[model samples]
Target: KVFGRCELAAAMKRHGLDNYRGYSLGNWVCAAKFESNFNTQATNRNTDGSTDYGILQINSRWWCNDGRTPGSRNLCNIPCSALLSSDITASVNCAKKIVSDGNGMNAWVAWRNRCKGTDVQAWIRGCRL
Candidate 1:
């Protein structure tokens, strides 16, 4: 399950990353490795008292609903918003864009470095382009 084949391919395309698949995939792999240890079903209570859910570790209060979880949001039906509601594919893609758009590896790197520290946000923060 380390390789997502079609899902990874689609993520690369959605984020305009076709030409950078090698590096992107490496980043993706590393992000997964560092974020939730690649667990798609991970969850945790953030320091700010927010709850993170799923692979991309989106917050339930802002992006999910339907009474499935305690404080889910209803943001899952929209396009990019689904990234918050669903899995990590779109979220990772979004993070990739963030990394490519000047924030660079330093952005996610900082998140992981300070927040998760050798864990979740750390790998995502280091997901350079």
Candidate 2:
């Protein structure tokens, strides 16, 4: 069950991120290209250049943290190691959270803004989904 581009698209669809989801599929695809190069396990610091971290580059360390000594944001639910573990479902859900919550994929939005109505399924030639 190796997830590919189309597979990711289908995953998005299943999770209610339909065609072009909130913007354009091409841009989202491009963001996936920029962020993780569509890598399901992609991880890094938040694009805002903050200490925040996680897939989709979530700044869980900051937003979730509180009180003295960075509080308890608990990146454990989505450890960088887990991100690299090939858990596509986890990564996808995380992305959905960001988008559905109105973050617009942050730096990844560039992928969506780049164009509109891109048939993401065609990008991968309709591979695994």
Candidate 3:
């Protein structure tokens, strides 16, 4: 589903992802935009043959099970399909676990490659918290 930037920000805030785990909401929003443009059902197959899922693009290689491949670590213990829903509970929970387990937003290549150290206010522009 296509989401307005402000609407997406509001939803993230409601889901407790605004500044979640000490990572800024701007960082999360920027990464989400680049990862999947806020589409819950988004999926991308990586060159390594792993798939990325959902708004955060959680990886099948480490986070969730896509079932297309075997030997997933499934760190989030969720079916990857669960992240591809309008309801973001599972994805949010999984994202929190991901950030906590590693280098914070570094878990997302979008953040590292695009959003890091950048002015991300455009992501939340005109959105009231």
- Every candidate's CA RMSD: 7.7, 5.1, 1.2
- Model number with the top lDDT: 3
What is the C-alpha lDDT profile of model 2 across 14-70, one tens digit per residue? 655554345444344545555565565544554444443223444454332312224
Q: Evaluate all candidate structures by whole-model CA lDDT and list the values in order.
A: 0.47, 0.48, 0.86
TM-score for each model: 0.43, 0.53, 0.93
Clashing pairs in 2: 7-129, 27-111, 27-112
- In candidate 1, what are the lDDT values of residues 71-109, reduced to their tens digit? 544454323235434345655555554456554545444
Better of 2 and 3 by lDDT: 3
Best by TM-score: 3
Best-to-worst TM-score order: 3, 2, 1
- lDDT value, residue 49 of candidate 1: 56
Clashing pairs in model 1, backbone N/Cα/C closer than 3 A: 64-72, 64-73, 65-73, 108-125, 109-125, 112-121, 112-122
Model 1 has how many clashing residue pairs?
A: 7
Error of 2 at 101 (Å): 2.9
Task: Flag the better candidate by lDDT, 1 or 3.
Answer: 3
- As for candidate 3, its clashing pairs are none
Ten-residue segment with the worst summed lDDT in candidate 3? 1-10
